[PDB]
């Protein structure tokens, strides 16, 4: 029993965190094989013009108390790829994956190439992450651990005026309509990840919380009309199919749980809580619920 | 900016997780140097659990009865001893991944990270607080026994909890790394119940200071309170009494924000009375109590 916002074990990622210094700028790098990946704003804009003026010895890379010598440098979108002489012995089995909004991942927050914390995050529908980052956190990575392979999905670049965070996949492609420079940028209007709220309602049912259940069901269209009114993401047939295992395990049809969410959206919690929360939680995917309520290890 | 329930990087702890098997029972062990620490109930059957004489059960065991597995490598148990409710399995290999570590016993309200494991394999990390009733609100399934709670301060891992059992209310009970239980619990299947829980007041105030540091000031008021009047109100909402130690501990946050601890107490009294009125504090509709004053300073400064 119990339901916590759980992150993947960070160990495999910790062995990849390095410090990247270029001029006065210090941020984090991800060292995989003989390449160090970091936000290209470390050189700061005409990034091709700024990069051509740099030599390899301008980038000081530090792995623990050991300096790595940079032998090459190239830019891929908004990421700088610093070729180094030493291949990281702690390099795990890894993939670079771009995630979709609503998908969750763990963030290993670092300062000066040193991991300080791990937390669970969701890619908001507005392509921002509600993270916890201070200055120096740039280059901190987001990941999922699939069996023994680390899927790198996020590299932190900046903080938006509302305190939310923006970053790229490991190929330098930003999540959202953001750019890596000091200009007027704002996070768009956010929405609730519906499939994730339903998944968390199934996790509450598995944990004995059933007060919100009702005898009612709904059509997917009737629910999507209600969801749109509360700034909830449209629920697709794919989401309904994805919730299938949880629906079979609890005996509550996805549209039956949708009718519960409909009543929670119109009537509220009425002083009650679900899994210790007075708000409907949307940062647990259906897979996160199955992994935590069945016990998958890495 | 931002405030998250943040756990410590688990890597140092992951390199210590092993699987301990005794007959049919399988649980996790913490391998530090040449010793594997695990709950002593690994020697028990499900029947024995009501009234087990652990000294009697342990004297009947030999070293080769304990199968210890570190990854895909079986470790050879060369000795065994019991220290309170922990079994210390001396092994023939010192863990090369052994970090700088300390065994620390924590007080209620203190927080720590939990690396939940099954079969010596880490599956997740989350943040926890030792409840005032000496239980932890964890996320644990069968086979999680032996999972550890820790803090990482600088480069040293402070081991503070080892998971032993789940109480009937879904909450968890365990020991420090010396085998001493937190709370009036025993490693037995006897009728045990978690006492009435209370909110860790110093932690709620710390989280209100974190909200102030992050620009949330809606809940502040023009009032102050005496410490005694705050506790008289706090007790009515099942909040832990706030001591002068707590007031002193909140000093740095009070200085940083400019809001006296007893003024922050007056805000809390008002939030208890009024509720949130559809508003949130740090993305939460409830008053959060699993962030200590130390956690807030570390997350809001470095
Ligand atoms: C002065 C400032 O805030 N910056 C401007 C900026 C613009 C564009 C890009 Cl790509 C990066 C950045 C950096 C930036 O967002 N850095 C930071 C990242 N994550 C959290 C932070 C929390 C407090 C401060 C900085 C943080 C630096
Ligand atoms: C009732 C039961 O399964 N057990 C009886 C018991 C009594 C005393 C001691 Cl010290 C240990 C234990 C074990 C126990 O609590 N194991 C478990 C630990 N953490 C979460 C669990 C979640 C579901 C099931 C077991 C869990 C086993
Ligand atoms: Cl303590």
From Swiss-Prot, chain B:
Peptidase C30 domain mapped to chain residues: 1-302
Signal sequence, start to end: none
Outcome following mutation: residue 189 to A: Does not affect ability to cleave and inactivate human TRMT1
Glycyl lysine isopeptide (Lys-Gly) (interchain with G-Cter in ubiquitin) crosslink location in chain: 5, 90
Activity regulation info: Inhibited by pyridone-containing alpha-ketoamides compounds 13a and 13b. In turn, alpha-ketoamide 13b (tert-butyl (1-((S)-1-(((S)-4-(benzylamino)-3,4-dioxo-1-((S)-2-oxopyrrolidin-3-yl)butan-2-yl)amino)-3-cyclopropyl-1-oxopropan-2-yl)-2-oxo-1,2-dihydropyridin-3-yl)carbamate) inhibits SARS-CoV-2 replication in human lung cells. Inhibited ex vivo by michael acceptor inhibitor N3. Inhibited ex vivo by compound 11a and 11b.
Catalytic residues of the enzyme: 41 (for 3cl-pro activity), 145 (nucleophile)
Effect of residue 145 to A: Complete loss of 3C-like proteinase nsp5 cleavage
Subunit structure: 3CL-PRO exists as monomer and homodimer. Only the homodimer shows catalytic activity. Interacts with host FBXO22; this interaction promotes the proteasomal degradation of nsp5.
Protein's job: Cleaves the C-terminus of replicase polyprotein at 11 sites. Recognizes substrates containing the core sequence [ILMVF]-Q-|-[SGACN]. Cleaves and inactivates human TRMT1, preventing tRNA guanine(26)-dimethylation of tRNAs. May cleave human NLRP1 in lung epithelial cells, thereby activating the NLRP1 inflammasome pathway. May cleave human GSDMD, triggering alternative GSDME-mediated epithelial cell death upon activation of the NLRP1 inflammasome, which may enhance the release interleukins 1B, 6, 16 and 18. Also able to bind an ADP-ribose-1''-phosphate (ADRP).
Name of the protein: 3C-like proteinase nsp5
The organism of origin for this protein: Severe acute respiratory syndrome coronavirus 2 (2019-nCoV)
Residues represented out of the complete protein: 3264 to 3565 of 7096
């Amino acid at each position: 029993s119990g339901f916590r916002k759980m992150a993947f074990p960070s160990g495999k990622v910790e062995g990849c965190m390095v410090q990247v210094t270029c001029g006065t700028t210090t941020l984090n790098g991800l060292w995989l094989d003989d390449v160090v990946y970091c936000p290209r704003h470390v050189i700061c804009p005409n990034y091709e013009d700024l990069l051509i003026r740099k030599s390899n010895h301008n980038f000081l890379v530090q792995a623990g108390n050991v300096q790595l010598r940079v032998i090459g440098h190239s830019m891929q979108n908004c990421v700088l790829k610093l070729k180094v002489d030493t291949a990281n012995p702690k390099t795990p089995k890894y993939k670079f994956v771009r995630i979709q909004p609503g998908q969750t991942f763990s963030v290993l927050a670092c300062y000066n190439g040193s991991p300080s914390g791990v937390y669970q995050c969701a890619m908001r529908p507005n392509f921002t992450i509600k993270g916890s980052f201070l200055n120096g956190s740039c280059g901190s990575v987001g990941f999922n651990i699939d069996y023994d392979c680390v899927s790198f999905c996020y590299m932190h670049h900046m903080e938006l005026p509302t305190g939310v965070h923006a970053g790229t996949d490991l190929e330098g492609n930003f999540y959202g309509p953001f750019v890596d420079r000091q200009t007027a940028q704002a996070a768009g209007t956010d929405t609730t990840i519906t499939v994730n709220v339903l998944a968390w309602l199934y996790a509450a049912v598995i944990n004995g919380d059933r007060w919100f259940l009702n005898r009612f069901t709904t059509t997917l269209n009737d629910f999507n009309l209600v969801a749109m009114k509360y700034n909830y993401e449209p629920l697709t047939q794919d989401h309904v199919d994805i919730l299938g295992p949880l629906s079979a395990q609890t005996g509550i049809a996805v549209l039956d749980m949708c009718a519960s969410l409909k009543e929670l959206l119109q009537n509220g919690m009425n002083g009650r809580t679900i899994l210790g929360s007075a708000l409907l939680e949307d940062e647990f995917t259906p897979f996160d619920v199955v992994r935590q309520c069945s016990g998958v290890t890495f």
